[model samples]
Target: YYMDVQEAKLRDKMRGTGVSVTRSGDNIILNMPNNVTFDSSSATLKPAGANTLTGVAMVLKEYPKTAVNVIGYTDSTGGHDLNMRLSQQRADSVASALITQGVDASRIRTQGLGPANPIASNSTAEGKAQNRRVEITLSPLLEHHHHHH
Candidate 1:
């Protein structure tokens, strides 16, 4: 009932946006596809991307115990070093945006997995665009128990 409710709320808030929301167990994944969220070889967030993230931040603030994971990816068109650096930069850009929007930085982690875990084939243009994406995963942070004196 906890995360399930959040999933629905997020779906409603993100309606008509390019971001795709999916859930697994208690974890929620937000997929920001290429062109909509970013352009090739760039870490800059498009206007749409920034707006999407702002909406996301609003919900994240509501759920203060949620942990956010911002992971960046790239298509197979770049060298290993370049892809890695670009992905990392993109992830940082996303995480920074969320932090700037007032999401707690301590609850967020960013990673850049370049060209790894491709959700589509990288050989074709359509697939390459799909492969170049940033994913934000939200999970419940376990609360600590305190002893009564």
Candidate 2:
């Protein structure tokens, strides 16, 4: 009930944003399509991206046990080294943005996968744009167990 209820609420909260919400086993995956999230070859979040992420942060506050791991990915067009740094910057940008919007820093982590994983082929413009993406996975924190002495 808790998970379902919260998920549905979040679905409602994020209806208009250009993000995809899904579940990968234990993790709730939120994919940000890079075509809309950033400008070409940059890690900067466009204004629309900020609004979308802010929407995410606002909904996240209601779930105290939820933790976020923001992972950034890029297309193959950029030089590998630049893509690597850009991806990391994007992930950190997302985590920082979440923190700025009141999500606890303790609850967030960041990773940059560069071009390691692509949801679509990079041979076409649309596909390449799709390749430049971010995956923000929300997982339940490990439950703390209390032992009575």
Candidate 3:
């Protein structure tokens, strides 16, 4: 019941876009392909991607009790060293955009898992396109139950 409202808003707002939304246990993951979020081997967020993120940020801000993880991925075409850096920068771009929209920076963590978790095979063109993406994972933030004192 806690995170239900946000998910409904997100589904309504992000409909008909390239962004894909999935639920994993208590986490909601939003997957944005590089074709829509960024360019090939580039860290800059595209205009359309930024627009999509703007809608995302709004929902995130409304639901302040969740922790948001902005993760970036890349295809295997580039060296691991290069892909890692590029992915990190892309994650930073997405996170910063949310921050710009007034979402608290402290509630967000950014990760660059360059080509590590490919949802599709990287051996083909369509798969490579699917591999290069950014995933935003949102989960409820629960307080610790134990007392230290």
Candidate 4:
């Protein structure tokens, strides 16, 4: 069904890449690499990042029932206000790219974390890079899920 196809397409393209993929409840979480996804302090995706998102968009296009959430995160390297806006802008940028690639605009949602999780310590540049990322989470559309007895 659409579910398996979605996973397979994603797994196929994502296997050799260093990107991390895992499930969070009903969601598929993609922990993408920051440098490839976006350059430092920029909301736009690099060409490499666009290629990655293109593959993702392909899978999403095939499965209309899939909903996507582009969540942006940042390291604690700047003021809260700046970080917050940057995070939101980055999330929007990724979501915009997906839409351009043919994924339904209505099915995608974007959120900005802005060092809200501070998942990594900002003490080092490397760690900061890890924290600066856009996590793409996918889930089954509400009506698309089947109920079991």
Candidate 5:
């Protein structure tokens, strides 16, 4: 749930779509842009997408106690198998970028939800674009044990 002022400022410059920062208890969720992370049918991170990761790294650095869960999603347009793989690769790329940016590798987890979750209808190109996305959910690592204890 921590973000430096610089990261907050950079949020204004995000393109195509913007990320939403939300918090639940000790967890902070960052819904990032999909198009910036992957081109049509591609798993590679775009140049600008790397910049987005930098912004996230900044936030994570400020909140070292938070564990991150990066989830990737895709629209239901392509083959189910391809979409699943693409989503996974995209999530891994994002997690890799964060690790490279100094976030602890052990504190991050990645997963893909290909076409399983959609924030908007995928009937239109814009909607489909919205459907494809990367979501980073941050939570306090210690909270897990405490909940059961």
Candidate 6:
């Protein structure tokens, strides 16, 4: 069915990368690395990152019923205030790119967690690199339904 095809494509895209793609009910979770998508201390998307976003947009567009949430994260190496802003801006930038690529703007929400949600420690460069990342979560648009019978 449609879900099977979608799952196949996701698997292929994530192949050879440590990133994981999982399905929870109707939602698909995509975890990506920070270095692949952006430069150190930068919110702008790197050229290499565009292909990933483009693929996401293609999937979302193909499945119009899905909504997306772009979550940005960072390591705790910098000031909290600055990290928060950077994370937020990075998330927004990603969301904006998806919107520009034909994904429904209204169906996407973005947030930047900065250092508060680090998956790794900031004490080491490798850990910091691991902590910096963007997580793309896609789910059915439950809010779009009306109560009408």
Per-residue accuracy of model 4 over 3-108 as CA lDDT, tens digit each: 6666677888987765677766667888786677777767767887888888888888887888888888888676878888888898898899989989889899
Better of 3 and 5 by lDDT: 3
Clashing pairs in 5: none
**lDDT at 42 for candidate 3?**
82
- Better by TM-score, candidate 5 or 3: 3
Question: Which is better, 3 or 6, measured by lDDT?
Answer: 3
Lowest-scoring 10 consecutive residues by lDDT in candidate 3?
140-149
- Each model's TM-score? 0.88, 0.84, 0.88, 0.83, 0.75, 0.81
RMSD of candidate 6 to true structure, Å? 2.9
lDDT of 1 by residue, 17-86 (tens): 8788979777998988767777555887888889988999998988888888888877858587888888
Between candidates 1 and 4, the TM-score winner = 1
- TM-score head-to-head 2 vs 3, winner: 3
62-91: candidate 3 lDDT, tens digit per residue: 878878888887786868888888888899
Ranking the candidates on lDDT from highest down gives 1, 3, 2, 4, 6, 5
Could you tell me which residue pairs clash in candidate 4? none
Q: Which of 1 and 5 is the better model by TM-score?
A: 1
Runs off by more than 4 Å, candidate 6: 1-4, 16-19, 22-26, 122-125, 145-149
**How good is model 1 by TM-score?**
0.88
The lDDT values for all models are 0.84, 0.81, 0.84, 0.80, 0.74, 0.77
Tens-digit per-residue lDDT, 43-80, candidate 5: 77777778778877877787677787888877868587
Q: In lDDT terms, how accurate is model 6?
A: 0.77
Model 2 per-residue lDDT at 9? 71
Cα displacement (angstroms), candidate 2, residue 25, comes to 2.7
